[PDB]
Design an enzyme around this catalytic site. Structure first.
Site, short mmCIF file in Angstrom:
data_model
loop_
_atom_site.label_atom_id
_atom_site.label_comp_id
_atom_site.label_asym_id
_atom_site.label_seq_id
_atom_site.Cartn_x
_atom_site.Cartn_y
_atom_site.Cartn_z
N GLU A 11 -6.65 2.74 6.02
CA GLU A 11 -5.94 2.57 7.26
C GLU A 11 -6.06 1.17 7.87
O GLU A 11 -5.23 0.79 8.66
CB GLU A 11 -6.49 3.59 8.29
CG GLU A 11 -6.36 5.05 7.86
CD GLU A 11 -4.96 5.56 8.01
OE1 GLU A 11 -4.15 4.71 8.57
OE2 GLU A 11 -4.63 6.64 7.63
N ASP A 20 3.11 2.13 12.39
CA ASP A 20 2.61 2.66 11.16
C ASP A 20 3.63 2.58 10.01
O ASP A 20 4.66 1.92 10.11
CB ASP A 20 1.87 4.02 11.39
CG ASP A 20 2.71 5.29 11.41
OD1 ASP A 20 3.97 5.07 11.21
OD2 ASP A 20 2.25 6.42 11.50
#
Ligand code: CL
Ligand code: CL
Length: 162
Positions: A11, A20
């Protein structure tokens, strides 16, 4: 290596609101804020979340505190899910990290959807499950991260991360 170091690699860390891979408003270590198009709807979620006026920016500490929450939440959701629980219980320590990884990224409802793959993991048919897991949007969208996770289930080691 452990679940936290694994997710931190997959991440990354970011101290400023960002989008994202799917286009959503995120912050820190993959903390989704909102699927809403509004940067304002994002800033507001963010202030509720931290307990202060952030104006889209947080500290390392704040980032890690959110991460602690999300990992725990992910683990408890797995143990509370009638479909997930049994799988998790059947698995060894590494592989267990792999399922927590999918759950953090895609939510409990999502993974709970991989009926077939779940069934093969439970039966310990590693190669088959690795093959079936790849037949998914998930794999097509984030193929390198998918591959890492999938190798973890296939092998049972942390090779893909070292
Ligand atoms: Cl497919
Ligand atoms: Cl990727």
């Amino acid at each position: 290596m452990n679940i936290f170091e694994m997710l931190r690699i997959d991440e990354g860390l970011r101290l400023k609101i960002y989008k994202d891979t799917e286009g959503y408003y995120t912050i820190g270590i993959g903390h989704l804020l909102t699927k809403s198009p509004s940067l304002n709807a994002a800033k507001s979620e963010l202030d509720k979340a931290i307990g202060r006026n952030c104006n889209g920016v947080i500290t390392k500490d704040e980032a890690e505190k959110l991460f602690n929450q999300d990992v725990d939440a992910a683990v408890r959701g797995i143990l509370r899910n009638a479909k997930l629980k049994p799988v998790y219980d059947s698995l060894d320590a590494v592989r267990r990290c792999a399922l927590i990884n999918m759950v953090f990224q895609m939510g409990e409802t999502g993974v709970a959807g991989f009926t077939n793959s779940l069934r093969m993991l439970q039966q310990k048919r590693w190669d088959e499950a690795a093959i079936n897991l790849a037949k998914s949007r998930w794999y097509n969208q984030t193929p390198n991260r998918a591959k890492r996770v999938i190798t973890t289930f296939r092998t049972g080691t942390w090779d893909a991360y070292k």
